[PDB]
């Protein structure tokens, strides 16, 4: 929770659009839509059927983490 | 190699002995209870650690206690 809050606030600060945080942080759908889904685009497009970027290793690590976390269950 | 201890609050109802699946416990003549008998644990090398004896003991707190320890091919309950 702490790191999510810090990261979203600083993302909005660095992009100059603090209004998005000021308006969307008061409800949970705002978090789920404007932080995670919004900022996962370039991550999940690290490698696709059209090629790969330098974010390919981070996309692979993202899937690896989801998988290990699932395996712990 | 589990260890089973009997404490002097026993009333000699013999439920622990009947509940034991590996014949670890037995009744011994005693003085100190109306039944005039107490439980003993001579075959502790055969104890598996199921703690049925503790579940069968009527007493505020248990008169029979099982302390789990070193594991052996008999304690692990291995048929192979």
């Amino acid at each position: 929770w702490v790191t999510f809050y810090w990261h979203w606030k600083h993302i909005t600060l660095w992009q100059g659009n603090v209004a998005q945080f000021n308006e969307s942080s008061t409800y949970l759908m705002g978090w789920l839509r404007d932080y995670l889904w919004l900022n996962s685009s370039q991550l999940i497009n690290g490698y696709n059927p059209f090629g790969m970027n330098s974010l390919s290793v981070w996309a692979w690590m993202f899937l690896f983490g989801h998988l290990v976390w699932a395996t712990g269950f | 190699a589990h260890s089973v201890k009997i404490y002097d609050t026993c009333i000699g109802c013999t439920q622990c002995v009947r509940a034991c699946p590996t014949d670890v416990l037995e009744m011994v003549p005693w003085d100190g209870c109306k039944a005039s008998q107490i439980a003993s644990a001579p075959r502790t090398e055969d104890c598996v650690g199921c703690k049925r004896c503790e579940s069968a003991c009527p007493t505020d707190f248990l008169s029979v206690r099982v302390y789990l320890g070193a594991e052996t091919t008999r304690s692990m309950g291995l048929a192979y």
Binding site: - | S3, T9, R18, E26, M27, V28, A41, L62
Partner: protein, 141 residues
């Protein structure tokens, strides 16, 4: 009592199973349970399945002491049948085990000595800090 010996008595009528003996019986101990039946009856094998016990002596090889004791408990509480079982080692040594002095453990018998009895309540045991850097366990005292 004088512990009994072993002999060559017939086995129950069983058609086989995959729950029988394994290499542990070959390289370690295995157990044999003996009993006498007045008539042929169908009973459930502790290893899974149904068997027929012969009229007269019976003998059965089992892999664990728990299997022997469960079968014996069922025999005693359901068929009113007295039973014995032993422990067999690979070299041929035989150890008589269940009715150690001929009396079942739930009946008090003379000549038995207490083992593991502590003459106090469970709340009077010592503290682990008192027996620090010592090999005692605070329930062995």
């Amino acid at each position: 009592t004088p512990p009994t010996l072993n002999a060559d008595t017939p086995a129950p009528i069983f058609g086989g199973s995959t729950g029988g003996l394994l290499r542990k019986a070959q390289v370690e101990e295995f157990y044999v349970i003996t009993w006498e039946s007045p008539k042929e009856q169908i009973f459930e094998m502790p290893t899974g399945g149904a068997a027929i016990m012969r009229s007269g002596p019976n003998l059965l090889k089992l892999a664990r002491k728990e299997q022997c004791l469960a079968l014996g408990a069922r025999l005693r509480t359901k068929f009113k049948i007295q039973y014995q079982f032993y422990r067999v080692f690979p070299n041929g040594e035989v150890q008589y085990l269940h009715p150690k002095d001929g009396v079942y453990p739930e009946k008090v018998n003379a000549g038995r000595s207490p083992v593991g009895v502590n003459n106090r309540s469970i709340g009077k045991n010592a503290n682990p800090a008192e027996l620090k850097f010592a090999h005692k366990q605070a329930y062995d005292l």
